[PDB]
Symmetry: D2
Subunit: 470 residues, 4 copies
């Protein structure tokens, strides 16, 4: 079976209980709700449909709420008509949202546009189709010189590479959506356009105010500012979503693949989930099979070491959602099959030298004894994520009494969570883990299993490794 996990964005074609059951059969592990669209009734109904399928089938899945976030965009044009911009011309942006634009000027949604920019900065419009350079800033207007020919339409994205943008983390709509997430008991929140660590902290404080302290925050890295502040963002987050397509608008095109590899590697070292997203199998919105290029790009993200890959439009609004999940699962299985363990220590936190020494040792022992299974006891999921860091060949069966942890571990590479009533002692954990190893069908009589847990320590440390024959 595959180890890499699949996040599927759910929309009208895939929201039914029948479709969700088939999505899970095809390899879906996590349902993404994109709050860029839909009202609370639709999203609530999607949550309920998945939970009904989970209850009926006994399958497990996680729910991830994805925030709309905040960006800069152009606004309206005369008669809604495109205007042709000529390289070398003057063109002006204004913060006055009432102004209707034309070939000479257009309004933007961000009032700080004049504050954050400076003469000489470069302004990008419509996913970097049109580049301009600021030549003057006066009152509510940013005067620019156009660099390349291009056609301007309405409501196009604006990108400011090399500039810090003082946009708040959460709009009012994002705050209400987060409260909805806490009321619904979602497992993850993915935050769009995370630019700096204070953005993550301000989401964390909102969730803690509404009973979501146990919800994991996945920061979406989508622009140059987020990439520059990656290390502080990761430290403050529970995980990362690499949004390759958005990032490629703002950084040099030859850097994008190295930004992805660097972010994935740091997430693995931090024992924090990483999702690779955007431009995965987009061609399958319209086509029943993907391109060679798409399949290769996905497989290379898996070889980079991603925990999970994500479908967006392919599953939300596309014509071939089940085909997209099936082929994605096929790529996952084909690629996972040829990956090896990474038994280097990679330990940077002295406070976790014990956990890392024991978990690394447990994977090395599993591999030398051909153990098909590592059984972990976990309360918060740390021990399972600490084992996964070394990319074991063995499947990780994670036993927990914490329902939230069981759901969240669905996103971690090669982890099979199992909710259990209780574990009263180390010896009881061995007894139960051997029974459930056999019941899971992931191991059989005579197989070696390695069992990992914390003994006479509180949650957050793993200090014990034990080898059993089933």
């Amino acid at each position: 079976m595959k180890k890499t996990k699949i996040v599927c964005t759910i929309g009208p074609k895939t929201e039914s209980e029948e479709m969700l059951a088939k999505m899970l059969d095809a390899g879906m592990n996590v349902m993404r709700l994109n709050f860029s669209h839909g009202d609370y009734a639709e999203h609530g109904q999607r949550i309920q449909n998945l939970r009904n399928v989970m209850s009926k089938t006994g399958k497990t899945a996680a729910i991830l709420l994805d925030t709309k976030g905040t960006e800069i965009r152009t606004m309206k044009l005369e008669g809604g008509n495109d205007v042709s911009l000529k390289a070398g011309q003057t063109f002006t942006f204004t913060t006055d949202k009432s102004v209707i634009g034309n070939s000479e000027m257009v309004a933007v949604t961000y009032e700080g546009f004049t504050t954050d920019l400076s003469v000489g900065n470069t302004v990008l419009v419509d996913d970097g189709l049109i580049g301009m350079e600021v030549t003057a800033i006066e009152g509510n207007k940013v005067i620019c010189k156009v660099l390349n020919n291009g056609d301007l339409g309405e409501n196009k994205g604006v990108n400011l590479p090399g500039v810090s943008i003082a946009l708040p983390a959460l709009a009012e709509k994002d705050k209400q959506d987060l409260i909805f997430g806490c009321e619904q008991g979602v497992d993850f929140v993915a935050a769009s356009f995370i630019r700096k660590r204070s953005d993550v902290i301000e989401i964390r404080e909102h969730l803690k105010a509404h009973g979501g302290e146990n919800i994991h925050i996945i920061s979406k890295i989508e622009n140059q500012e987020g990439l520059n502040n990656f290390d502080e963002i990761l430290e403050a987050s529970d995980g990362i979503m690499v949004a390759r397509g958005d990032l490629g608008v703002e950084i040099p095109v030859e850097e994008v693949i190295f930004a992805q590899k660097m972010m994935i590697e740091k997430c693995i070292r931090a024992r924090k989930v990483v999702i690779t997203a955007t431009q995965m199998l987009d061609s399958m919105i319209k086509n029943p099979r993907p391109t060679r290029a798409e399949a290769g790009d996905v497989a290379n993200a898996i070889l980079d070491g991603t925990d999970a890959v994500m479908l967006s439009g392919e599953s939300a609004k596309g014509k071939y959602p089940l085909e997209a999940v099936s082929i994605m699962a096929t790529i996952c299985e084909r690629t996972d099959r040829v990956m090896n363990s990474r038994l280097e220590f990679n330990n940077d936190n002295r406070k976790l030298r014990i956990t890392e020494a024991v978990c690394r040792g447990a994977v090395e022992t599993a591999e030398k004894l051909d153990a098909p299974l590592i059984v972990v006891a976990t309360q918060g999921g740390k021990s399972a994520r600490a084992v996964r860091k070394y990319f074991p060949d063995a499947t990780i069966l994670a036993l927990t009494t914490n329902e939230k942890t069981a759901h969240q571990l669905v996103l971690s590479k090669g982890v099979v969570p199992q909710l259990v009533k209780e574990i009263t002692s180390t010896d009881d954990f061995y007894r139960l883990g051997k029974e459930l190893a056999l019941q899971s069908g992931l191991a059989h009589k005579g197989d070696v299993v390695v069992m990992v847990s914390g003994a006479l320590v509180p949650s957050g440390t793993t200090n014990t490794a034990s080898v059993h024959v089933l």
Copy 2:
């Protein structure tokens, strides 16, 4: 400077001496002539233009002739009009080339169509857009059942995965083109649609009949048959071109990226050049910059270990040839920069244990002494290709008296060839190599260089490694 080499297909927009000089400045190393188009006068003029630029500037480059090759294609339709094929319908192919097709039947160019196929085989038309299954074969007709809906146009490619096709290696036009290559003294021949080792042997015998015995044959792997026979094809060839897009028509889409990685790895182990080709920066035929996906795919082929990457339409007929070469060179430099040496022995030929032990040792010694340069003496190029196998950080300065070898080494990763008058002894090689190391500007006073050669042995063995301070 980059190490990965760039093959550029030259066409009307890039054939002038002025353009060729700018192509070389931008990072072009090898000129590809695609004999699918153009007459002998055009190709002869392109060869002469490059050689004039080489003589005037003293820059070096190689010339690669790419054969049209042999394939199966459909033919004409009624009124030249597309017909819509419906899944589950009957559809017939005929070998009678005079028949004009319609929604029920079409002719194919291959007379062996009825011989090589069998009931139950799958037939693919137009880069696998329409799939069919053979239901009967009678006389000159292959009767099929259509599997998916699709529109059929005229002159579309036919693919027969899981079938061996008895097509000759060379058409009559290919034979004349090869003779032209020998008369022009081209450095490489790239052979399209190589299916088995006998195809390579039959090209080798044609070249040896026209004074082209020293021309290197690059086999193009473009279909399932060539991939299945890869090992025998490589053994008979001097190098490989991985044509990813063509291969993806016939094998499962999740296998393509592993076919590429496997072929590249085997070429490296065999000390034979490998080119990664097709679907590289195709978007730049129309756009002045490539996509994130394209840049990532190219970089991953370099991290796989390709000697060279190839531009096709981007340089031959596209609107932004110099932009395409520039960004390709930028991706090469960015990616080469972070690759490490591969100091594993990987020696499978007992007849070359000495060459591999000395060359591997020389790279290890270069890396431990921070030598920026490995100077190799070579007659046929083997010693330079044997050093390159270990991906040295150092540049390889390859000294030779053989003009053909000097040109061919332009395609090998990280090799800078230099034609010299003579080398009369090992000590004379050290004297000259130190002078030329300094003259090349690749090393300076006080730098360590490692110098590799064959002493008291004939061509084809490398047995000596020597460490000098400039």
Copy 3:
């Protein structure tokens, strides 16, 4: 503190309770009783004296009974006088024990002498001083030609290298001595002149028949036959004593140091205790300090990897017994100090080796001063010791015999405990006793090794705790 263990042969000068207490303070770990001499009353009194000291002081030690065994020796000469043998002369051995010898003939103690020998075999007399070659065998006489000049005295050792000797494993005296060992509850039996596997099995069956099935057998390798059959002897034994001096009589002198190194390495690999013995500090029988050569020889046996070193006459009858133990302990501590772990890796014991090797590797990566093992039969403690950990091994057991036997294993500190009811209870108790032992302090890492939900004989669990 040293890790290598010291075996001391106890005799008249070292048998008092006062002396035994000082021997233990000086570094004695195991008492050897040499049953070549002394009666049951003397040996019983030495056992009683040591157990009194152990009870009074709470110090621990092991008791090893060393059998006399059987050998071939010449017998009496006319008027007790030496005779000079001339190279090239005829000389005859007879099995008739009544014959009084002379320059032409002497009797031997072994009746099978005529049976086991053949024309052309080599006979060695008096630690190989006189060599001869068999030229004929007739009735009860082995007729020989003398090879080198020498003087023959009375009661000299006879060696037949390259010949198998059909001497029983145990003489009747050895059988009675082993029964005494069982009566006394000794921890080890060292069997002299082990020649082959059947010898070990005969001892194992004899001990089992007299309630000594838990007594460990240390096979003494002293001759060429024992060395040739080493692999099967080790497999049947619980440990080995390398008797270098005796072995040097029968094999080429340049081979002796490699026989020692080979036997030690194989004992380590088998997780079986090995003692290096004979010619250790012999000069200290008469001198208050040893020679340079003796100190180097002892240190090299430790660097070879021996669990223990052994004093013979130096401690049993010598004039400087306490000095000999003190300098031996000093050599042990100086040499143990600079030795490193050996972390290189029976399909039946792949689990035990994987866990114990991993435990030592983890201990060293975390600078753990202590590995705490739970053990019933001592296997788990011996499995950890195989990798020469820097850390001390605190071995917790409820088995009194095991606690004593682990005294001989390198770097092992045994501690008898009332019980261990669960894996978590083992961690609780092991951390308490780690602190109580003074071998580790608050904040130190300890690695704790045990068998969970498996019977004795397998070690499957490793756990890391901060004290």
Copy 4:
């Protein structure tokens, strides 16, 4: 064939040409002349006899001159009679060489005795048999308290461990003996009782002043002061002789074996020859075979990595000189056989070490029986030997002094050649001589190491050839 080299001290029983030829056949590589005894006529005749044998047979050997050096000794007693010293008594040393000693006072040979000592220092007499402590120093007398009982005889060694002795490096006799060494063109000088770096420099300057600048200096480490200054002594020397017996008198006995191991390892790392000496096979002065202990001690010094082992009285005056060399060669061959290469890696010599280490690694990956080196001063041959190659080193040189000196280096077979005009000529000639040597045959791989377009002192080229 063995790789470890054998130094033999030549005396009356081994000085004849007939004996020397048999010594070389038995495995002697280097002749030691001990200038503690004998006059220039005797030593000159031994040199002449060896060079005659070398000329007649074509065998090669090196000549090492060993200086007497300077030490402190007691002097005469009244009537030549021993006196018994009682622990706790007063006992006085005087620098007045005319005083005849008794149970209360004795003279010493060293006039600086009162200068170098201080109240509280320790004085050792007769190989440390009698210890004393300085209680006062007045004029020409050092007043002491005796620590242990002992009998004092005449002319006994005095040791002052933990004190620096201001004895000159060379006595006047040593200076004349070194001039003799220069006259005779000896290959090595071994300097007794080297205490510090200035001693080595004084010898180096003395040899340079008498045409001996090409003579290699082997510093003898025999006491505590020399051992403390070892690093600077090695740096100034061409090699080291580890005199274990003498060193055992002044440092704690458990340290001697580690001083040996440390000095050998540092000599290897410095690419400088090391000799292990004293207490090697001493029992063979009287016996036709050595002891188990002696054989093991010699083998462990070889496993430590010594270039050479040395016979003293065993070859100079003993009753079994040929037997001693034969068994020593047997130990060498048996021990060298099982040793492995050490392929682990001065910024000025990074190139030489990278090429020579690589050459040994390549030789072993291709099963090359032979590494052929071109050398002027011997550095390149010694640089390859540092990695303990399995292959024999055939060292081609035009320097006669170098050819002789390489006889002392482990596993090196030197061969004098007329000339080497180029790198390609070196390969041509080396392949011919590889075949002629009988050390390699048609189809064998050889690795050939040399300096190309660099002066002496750097090795930069490695080349692989099939014979």
